[PDB]
Structure 1
Amino acid sequence: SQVYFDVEADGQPIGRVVFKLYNDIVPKTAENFRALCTGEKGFGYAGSPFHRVIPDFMLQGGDFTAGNGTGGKSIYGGKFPDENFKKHHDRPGLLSMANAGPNTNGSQFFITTVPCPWLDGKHVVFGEVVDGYDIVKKVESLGSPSGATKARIVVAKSGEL
């Protein structure tokens, strides 16, 4: 199960990032992300920004309702419980669920650019970057410690392979 993001910075195509989802370990979390990528439910990631990009840490996005971390929702209604914490944040290039504490998974996600073991048991890891990591790096280079970006970076288009 692979999905992708066509990323743009200020309307300029930067490249396509492809993720492999861990359907076998976290099927419910993977399905949520997959559906949001295709937009088949009537809402999703296309057009949503990477509102928080922090160099030496991670890229966060997925808030398609407010684009600032206060919005977003899962395909299950509101927020859903943490499926499990089997997968760990042992290296860069991992897809994990951003949240507001225990069992508050919605649509926001983050892509690690460094190992983040201290997040184990706190955030549900559900995928990895299999193509376009160089694009993740280009996006990271446009971030700042506060997470703010000078360019408007968005998931211009998304879908499943």
Structure 2
Amino acid sequence: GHMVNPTVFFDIAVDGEPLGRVSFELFADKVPKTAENFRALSTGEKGFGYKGSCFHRIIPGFMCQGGDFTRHNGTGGKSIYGEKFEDENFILKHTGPGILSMANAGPNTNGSQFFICTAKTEWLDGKHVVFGKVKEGMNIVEAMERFGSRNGKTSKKITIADCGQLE
């Protein structure tokens, strides 16, 4: 039947202590290639992915960035496609808190890194691909946000202790 947009979860920890769960709707109807990458990295089904990775940069009143599961600092990451992949489209905009969007280093350089907005970031429209939104647990993202700083260094270690796909 009809494709149902996937739901994925992250169970977040702070210095190894459970914080709570954030779940996301992935807009596979609009950005299928991008949604699928994040979905598969969340389940780990290719043999690599987000489980155990950290949020390396958190700037309160802006965004939380993660997904660098290879180098843990924003210098690494890889997609499920064997290479960075293209910007699918820019249909969806950075409208406010909870938007899930791809990090990149130029046109057509999507890997695994992503960010969760904690504010409207409209200046990123048209250059970062929006592919999902927080469904439940925006309060958990707001709690994470408190451990960021102006320059984005976190004051506690913020990890994805577990992640996967929901019904």
Instruction: Give the alignment's TM-score, normalised by structure 2.
Output: 0.96
User: Where does residue 105 of structure 1 map in the other structure?
Assistant: 110
Unaligned 5+ runs, structure 2: 1-5
Alpha-carbon separation, structure 2, partners of 1:112 and 1:149 = 16
Give how far 1:150 is off: 1.4
2:146 maps to 1:141: yes
- Number of aligned residue pairs: 161
Residue aligned with 1:65, SS: coil
Instruction: Report the Cα distance in structure 2 between the residues aligned to 1:138 and 1:91, rounded to whole angstroms.
Output: 17
Identity %: 66
Runs of 4+ with >6 A deviation:
none
Partner of 1:159: 164
Aligned twin of 1:5? 10
Give the one of 31, 48, 51 matched to 2:53: 48
- 1:33 partnered with 2:25: no
Displacement of 1:90 in angstroms is 1.1
Q: What is the alpha-carbon root mean square deviation over aligned residues? A: 0.4
Q: TM-score, normalised by structure 1?
A: 0.99
- For 1:9-53, what per-residue CA distance to the aligned partner results, in whole angstroms no more than 9, with x for missing partners? 000000000000000000000000000000000000001000000
Residue 127 (structure 1) aligned to one of 110, 125, 132? 132
Q: Using the alignment, how far apart are the partners of 1:28 and 1:159 within structure 2?
A: 18
Aligned to 1:90: 95
Whole-Å separation in 1 of the counterparts to 2:154 and 2:96? 24
Q: Output the CA distance in 2 between the equivalents of 1:18 and 1:139.
A: 14
Distance of 1:141 and 1:134 partners within structure 2: 11
1:71 corresponds to 2:76: yes
SS in 2 for 1:51: strand
Q: Which is further off, 26-35 or 147-156?
A: 147-156
